[PDB]
Structure 1
Amino acid sequence: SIINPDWNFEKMGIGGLDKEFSDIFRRAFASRVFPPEIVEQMGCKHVKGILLYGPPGCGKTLLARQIGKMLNAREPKVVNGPEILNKYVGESEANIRKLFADAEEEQRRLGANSGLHIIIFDEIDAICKTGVHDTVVNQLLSKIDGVEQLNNILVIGMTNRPDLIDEALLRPGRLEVKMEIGLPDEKGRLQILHIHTARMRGHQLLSADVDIKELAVETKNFSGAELEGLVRAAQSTAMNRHIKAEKAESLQVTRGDFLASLENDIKPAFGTNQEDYASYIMNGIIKWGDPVTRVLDDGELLVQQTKNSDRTPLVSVLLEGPPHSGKTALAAKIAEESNFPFIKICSPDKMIGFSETAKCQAMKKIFDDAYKSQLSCVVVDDIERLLDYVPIGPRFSNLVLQALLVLLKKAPPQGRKLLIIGTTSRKDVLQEMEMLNAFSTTIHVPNIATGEQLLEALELLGNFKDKERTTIAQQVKGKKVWIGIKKLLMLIEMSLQMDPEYRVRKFLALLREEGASP
């Protein structure tokens, strides 16, 4: 044969990715497809060196098996790694020599024309770094260097620490090409769950009520091992329920078992989606007047502008208003309204006790991650706390300000897009630090400033009504009211705590005392 461009691998039983194939197989075909003698005449070197790196559990071993099988090579030999490297040097000499001799004997016997041997290694980072490390690394390098001239060497290795491996191992002609395996993928997670549940359905024991789509949606960042453990826990809890009970003939696994196993037994690795919106928007968005609609309209218009256009891939916004006016929730709602693939919120609640350098690193990491997807939206709230500000002196951090000022006007890689939303409550400070000159536009969030709006909001929230509402309206009308939305909830809660008949008095007294003048 001259070509094997068959790509049933994704549907063969392993998801993986559908991009590596092109590079891997184009290089393999270039190396080996052509007749050997012309290659000898041209004096080109066959590719020998592969390193699949990343966090464990992503399914690297299966990829290494598939590439070995699909490639027309001999059966694979593999070692955990430190095993070969015994404490005593000299073991790392005979032991290393025998592995290479295993293929040398066949290569000599069969001459130049011979098959490819695929030797798999794991945890190379452990050995690469007390004088045993250098000698072991040199002994390994000796064969691939060219002194031993082995032309049949497929060395697919694995590791988790790219910074604790000699770069000489990747010097041209040593490892050359590299790749890493990422998250289990939402659609890939769906596919793996489908494969496992199809193996289950092979006997139709699984109940029809169970669905794959919703389950895959719920579970976030569960490596294949984690999903298999979840399946095992589900089966175990179903068995427990059965034993605590003809029932055997009626054994069926229900969704509730899956939910209980997910909640109790299996610990996630990365799951956050159902925390952000639940926490930051805790009481929902309640319309109180006309000003609430303008902000949302402008947000949607800006989202549309950033979605489809060129010559302006980067757009920035700034929400400003008096304190206790509910700026974080509205920005979160604007972020949720669109359906961008990537959405993240950077707030100071998670960086207590940090120094400025750590905050810079965290912001940089979030932005770097946000640069990858096709288009994304980011939110920064309490800009005046990120750069800790004290009206005495005044004092603040220069490094964070410089990093933010640079990041706000740095275009993403070619062809991508990005949206940034920021929130603050002190515009004059930013105006003085020449930071308001970077944001493209601004949006003003006002407070309640009329008795009619106060009555409407109170009625929509409920609680006070009938004669209480009539008295409140009579008292408030013909006056000036200036109160933030977030303060109204606290005041109403406080006033509701008194005796049933002595409630309106406390609320009116509190409202009159506070609110001051605008």
Structure 2
Amino acid sequence: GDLVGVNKDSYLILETLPTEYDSRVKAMEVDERPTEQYSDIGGLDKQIQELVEAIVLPMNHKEKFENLGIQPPKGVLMYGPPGTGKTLLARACAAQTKATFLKLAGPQLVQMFIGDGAKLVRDAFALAKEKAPSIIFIDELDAIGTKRFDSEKAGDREVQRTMLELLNQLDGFQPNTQVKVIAATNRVDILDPALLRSGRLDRKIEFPMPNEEARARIMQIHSRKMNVSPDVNYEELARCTDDFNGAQCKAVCVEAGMIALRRGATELTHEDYMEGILEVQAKKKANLQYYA
């Protein structure tokens, strides 16, 4: 091992002291519980369960899996045009699983020196095996997971080898079947074909632009705290939402929280939602002028 006390010139080890190694590579960040819950989303009900299943099933049903000889999934991919809410949603799943949450990211695996990414991933799994099954979430794996075409070299190539080392840990190392790890990416434009496995990415969910009824449900849960003017039909605001991402929905939600005092511009009512809805892609202006 390492970390054995040797005292001055005496050169005698009295006791071998824990825990593992080393420095800030040891503990990335200690997290407890999220505030939000999985009930803050809508329209994803069928596709969110695919993520909810794979993480929840090994907890309680592990005794039922040993009877039928079933291996629980490990790698899971969460992607969609942002905002898809995957940052808080996959984090809100750590409260239901009761497992300890550890914050991690692609850039977090990058350091100044060489070979440090290979030291970080082997460092987390060492704490993962000791701390019992847990939940580790990473964000934007496709960035560090880009093998491009030719070389050399990619700046993150140290991590793109470490990500493939994670595939080797999910290949040759049996203990890596423990402490399921959650992954999320912005785009599937760059995806490794070797990622297919139960230990590797297994459940991979394509999150499209939420439905017009789904965009109304997710934005109502966010606006339930604020005080809004009465007479909200919910019919026009749902239909006026098309192709818009969940983050652009909160952009209207955050906008809808400013309408109380004055604001001073006059929103009145029922035009609030369609205001910030058009803000990003609209509004003419032109149309015609300078042209026909």
Q: How would you bin the TM-score normalised by the shorter chain?
A: 0.5 to 0.7
Tell me, yes or no, if structure 1 residue 254 matches structure 2 residue 280.
Answer: no
Q: Equivalent residue for 1:200? A: 226
Secondary structure of 1:83's aligned partner:
helix
- The answer to whether the 8 Å contact 1:233/1:261 transfers is no
Of the three residues 190, 198, 204, the one matched with 2:216 is 190
Q: CA deviation at 1:225?
A: 2.1
In structure 1, runs of 5+ residues without a counterpart are: 1-8, 108-115, 245-251, 272-518
Q: CA deviation at 1:42?
A: 6.6
Tell me, yes or no, if structure 1 residue 100 matches structure 2 residue 114.
Answer: no
- The answer to whether the 8 Å contact 1:207/1:253 transfers is no
Shift in CA distance, 223/93, structure 1 to aligned 2, threshold 3 Å: same
Q: Distance in 1 between matches of 2:174 and 2:248?
A: 44
Seq. identity, %: 33
**1:136-180 CA deviation, whole Å, 9 max, x = no partner?**
223323432342623422111011332412221224541122112
Q: Distance in 2 between matches of 1:241 and 1:33?
A: 52
Of the three residues 134, 140, 147, the one matched with 2:173 is 147
Q: Equivalent residue for 2:140? A: 123
- The answer to whether the 8 Å contact 2:57/2:72 transfers is no
Shift in CA distance, 29/97, structure 1 to aligned 2, threshold 3 Å: closer
**1:107-142 CA deviation, whole Å, 9 max, x = no partner?**
4xxxxxxxx211101111111212525532233234
- The answer to whether the 8 Å contact 2:102/2:136 transfers is yes
Q: Equivalent residue for 1:267? A: 280
Q: CA deviation at 1:259?
A: 6.5
Q: CA deviation at 1:22?
A: 5.8
- TM-score, with normalisation over the residues of structure 1? 0.40
Tell me, yes or no, if structure 1 residue 54 matches structure 2 residue 71.
Answer: no
**1:274-300 CA deviation, whole Å, 9 max, x = no partner?**
xxxxxxxxxxxxxxxxxxxxxxxxxxx
- The answer to whether the 8 Å contact 1:234/1:261 transfers is no
Shift in CA distance, 84/222, structure 1 to aligned 2, threshold 3 Å: same
Give the residue type in structure 2 aligned to 1:200. Answer: M
In structure 2, runs of 5+ residues without a counterpart are: 1-36, 148-152, 284-292
Give the residue type in structure 1 aligned to 2:103. Answer: V
Q: Equivalent residue for 2:114? A: 89
Shift in CA distance, 24/233, structure 1 to aligned 2, threshold 3 Å: closer
Q: Distance in 2 between matches of 1:193 and 1:22?
A: 20
Q: Distance in 1 between matches of 2:137 and 2:201?
A: 13
Of the three residues 213, 219, 224, the one matched with 2:246 is 224
**Bigger fraction of residues in helix:** 1
Shift in CA distance, 34/171, structure 1 to aligned 2, threshold 3 Å: closer
**1:438-493 CA deviation, whole Å, 9 max, x = no partner?**
xxxxxxxxxxxxxxxxxxxxxxxxxxxxxxxxxxxxxxxxxxxxxxxxxxxxxxxx
Q: Distance in 1 between matches of 2:271 and 2:260?
A: 6
- TM-score, with normalisation over the residues of structure 2? 0.66
Of the three residues 186, 200, 204, the one matched with 1:178 is 204
- The answer to whether the 8 Å contact 1:222/1:268 transfers is no
Q: Distance in 1 between matches of 2:190 and 2:79?
A: 12
Q: Distance in 2 between matches of 1:45 and 1:100?
A: 19
Q: Distance in 2 between matches of 1:162 and 1:48?
A: 19
> Highest CA radius of gyration, 1 or 2?
1
- The answer to whether the 8 Å contact 1:119/1:155 transfers is yes
- The answer to whether the 8 Å contact 1:142/1:148 transfers is no
- The answer to whether the 8 Å contact 2:106/2:138 transfers is yes
- The answer to whether the 8 Å contact 2:77/2:185 transfers is yes
Shift in CA distance, 261/27, structure 1 to aligned 2, threshold 3 Å: closer
Shift in CA distance, 260/162, structure 1 to aligned 2, threshold 3 Å: closer
Higher-RCO chain (CA-CA 8 Å, sequence separation at least 6): 2
Secondary structure of 1:150's aligned partner:
helix
How many residues are paired up?
A: 239
